[PDB]
Amino acid sequence: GIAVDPAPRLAGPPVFGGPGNDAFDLAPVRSTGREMLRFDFPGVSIGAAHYEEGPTGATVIHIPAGARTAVDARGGAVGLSGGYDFNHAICLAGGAGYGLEAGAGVSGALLERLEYRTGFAELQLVSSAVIYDFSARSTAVYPDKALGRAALEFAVPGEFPQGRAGAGMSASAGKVDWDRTEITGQGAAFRRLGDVRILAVVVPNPVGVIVDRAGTVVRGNYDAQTGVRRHPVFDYQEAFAEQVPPTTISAIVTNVRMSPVELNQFAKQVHSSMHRGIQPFHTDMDGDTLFAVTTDEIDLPTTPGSSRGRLSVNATALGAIASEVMWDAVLEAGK
Amino acid sequence: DPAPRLAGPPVFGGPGNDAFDLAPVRSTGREMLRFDFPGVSIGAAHYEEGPTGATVIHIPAGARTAVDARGGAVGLSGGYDFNHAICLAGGAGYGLEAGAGVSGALLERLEYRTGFAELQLVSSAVIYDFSARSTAVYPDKALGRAALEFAVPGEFPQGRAGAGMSASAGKVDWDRTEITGQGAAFRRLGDVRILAVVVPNPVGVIVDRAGTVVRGNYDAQTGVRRHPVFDYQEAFAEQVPPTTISAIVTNVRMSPVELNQFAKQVHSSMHRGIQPFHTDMDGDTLFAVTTDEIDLPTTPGSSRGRLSVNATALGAIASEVMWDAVLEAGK
Ligand code: NA
Ligand code: NA
C-alpha cells in the first residue's frame, strides 16, 4: 500500500533566461533519491546521475548481455533514439530532445569497454527516450554525453533510487495549467513469482495526473485554491462549457521468453494499462514511450492452462501481472 | 563503365576516438554542387583518422518532415515531424552522437531558450561504415558541431565527403563491395524546388536508368559488376539444398498525410536505382521535408492531363531528382 505524500509539491513557474551546460563546471552526482529499491535480477543494473545545476538527470538500465526489446510510442511529442529491437542499455533522460545526448554517452562508453570492436554482432545498442523538464526549473542544463557516461558508470546491480533521482529529478504531472503542476520523480517496482522476474521503471512527466487504485488523484493537478487534486476531466468539461458554448517514459524488463510478436503486443498491453494510473494518457501532448525488454531466461509452458483456467499462463497473463508492477512504479514516482 | 573502387577487407583492432586528438575537416568531396534554395544550408565534416563524417542539412526556420524508415537495421534519432536539421552520419549507431552535437549547438544559438515552440529539433540517421576502413573512429558530438558550423547555403560536396566518406555498396560478398560516397541533385520547375541528398551504403548495388549496374558487386576476377540477383539465384540453386539514408527537400506545401505518402513514394522509387533495396539488412531511412512556401493548384489539370498537377506528380518528379543524387554518390 504505497503511502503517497498528500502534501503538494507544486513545480512553480520557471524563471526564464537561465544558463546552459557550459555556464557550469558540471560534476555528475550519483542520484540516491528518497529511498533505494533493492531487487534481485542478475544481469540488470541501474545507474542514475544528475546535475544539481539543472536539476536534471539520466537513468540508465544496463543489460550487458543485450536483450530483445519492443518499443511502444504514443502521442505527438515522442523523443526517441535507437528504438532498437535489441539493447544493451536503455537511457531515460530529462532535457527534452537535447537529453538524447546522454544515450550517446552511454553508447560511446560501451564502445570503449569493448575496446572499440565494431563487428556488426558487437555493436552496442542503446535506446533512449526523453521528457521535457525545462518548465520545472530555470536553467537550460540538460543531460549530456558526460552525464549518460556517469549514469552508466554509477550503475549498480539490483538497486534503483526512487523519487527525485536520475531522469526523475525534475519530472512533473498535471498540465491543464502549470499553476497546478506537481513534481513527480521516477519510480520502480519489482516482483518475483517463482522464477519469473518483472522490473518496472517509470519516469512520469504526464500531461495527466497520477491516480491510485481507489481512483484517487494523488499527484498532479493540485489546485492551491481548493487544496485538492481533481481529475483533469473536470477542468476540461468546465473549460468546454465555458469556451465552446451553444510524457511518460518507462521500461518493463522481464526474464520470460517472448517472441517478437508476443513482446510487441505485451508492450502495447502494459503501456495501455498505464491509462489506469495516469489520466489522461497517450495524449497528443505526451511523448509516451514504453520499452518492453525480455532477457529470454525462462520459457512459458507450451500450453496455457492451470487450475485457475484454460487460458491462464501466457503472455497476456504476464502482461496483466506486469501492468500491476508498472502501476506500483508509477505510484512510487508520485509518492 | 567506371573504374573499380573496391573497399577491400577491413583490418580489425584499429584505433578509436580516444587514441587521437581528432581534428574536424571541412569536407569538399570531388566537386561542389551549387543550387538556389533559400533557407536550406548544408555542412559536411569528416575525420581523416576514420575516415568517416557527418553531413548536416540545416533549415533554420524549421520544416515539416515525414520519415519513411524500412528494413531491419534502422539507426534513427528523433524522427520528428518538424526539424531544424537533419544529420546523416557514419559510425553506425555511435554516429547518432553527431546529431547531438548539432542539437546542442542549436540550443546555444537560440541563447538557451527552451520554450516548447523553440525546441531545436534534429533528426539523425546513420550508416555502418566500419567494414570500409581499419579504424573505429566515429562521428562524435564535436564533428556534428563542426558540420553545422561548416554549413552554407547552396552548396553540397559530392562524393567522399561528410557521411559519404566511407559509404559502400554491393554486399553479397565483401570482396566485391565498392566505396560509394554521398550525392545530391537539385531541380527547379517554375517556383518549385526539389533537393535530393543521399548517402547510399546499400547491401544492393547502384543501377542507372538503362539498368546497368554502375557501383557495387564488382568482381576483380572478371572486371565486371553483377546485379546481386544473379549471385542470389545461383546461391540458392547451389545451397538450397546442396542502408541508404536520404532526404528530399522541397518548397511545396503538403499536408501531413500528403507529405507522408510523398515520402513513401519517393523512397520506394529508389528501388529503381538501388537493387535490392528496403531489405532486412538495410536501415533505409528517407526524410521528406517541405519548407511550405508554394501552394499546389486547387484542381490538378493541365494541358498535359486532367490529373497532372498534384502531390503524386511532385512525387514522380522528386523520384527522378533522387535517382540523379544516387548516381552522383556512385560516380
Ligand atoms: Na539473455
Ligand atoms: Na579524442
Author numbering:
A (entry chain B): 15 to 260, 267 to 355
B (entry chain A): 19 to 260, 267 to 355
Describing publication, verbatim:
Nylon hydrolase (NylC) is one of the three enzymes responsible for the endo-type degradation of the by-products of nylon-6 manufacture (cyclic and linear oligomers of 6-aminohexanoate (Ahx) with a degree of polymerization greater than three) and various aliphatic nylons (e.g., nylon-6 and nylon-66). However, the post-translational autocleavage of the nascent polypeptide between Asn266 and Thr267 generates an active enzyme with an α subunit (27 kDa) and a β subunit (9 kDa). Based on the X-ray-crystallographic structure of NylCA, we reported that four αβ heterodimers (molecules A-D) form a doughnut-shaped quaternary structure. In addition, we proposed that the nucleophilic N-terminal residue Thr267 in the β subunit functions as a catalytic residue for either autocleavage (from precursor to active enzyme) or substrate hydrolysis.
His130 and Leu137 in NylCp2 were located in a loop between helix α1 and β-strand β7 (designated “loop 3”). Moreover, the temperature factors (index of thermal motion in a crystallographic structure) of loop regions 1–3 in NylCp2 were significantly larger than those of the corresponding regions in the thermostable NylC-G122Y130 mutant. In the thermostable enzymes, loop 3 and η3 (in monomer A) was mutually stabilized by contacts with loop 1 and loop 4 in monomer D. We found that the V225M substitution, which was close to Gln299, decreased the expression and/or stability of NylCp2 in cells, whereas this mutation increased the stability of NylC-G122Y130 by 2 °C9.
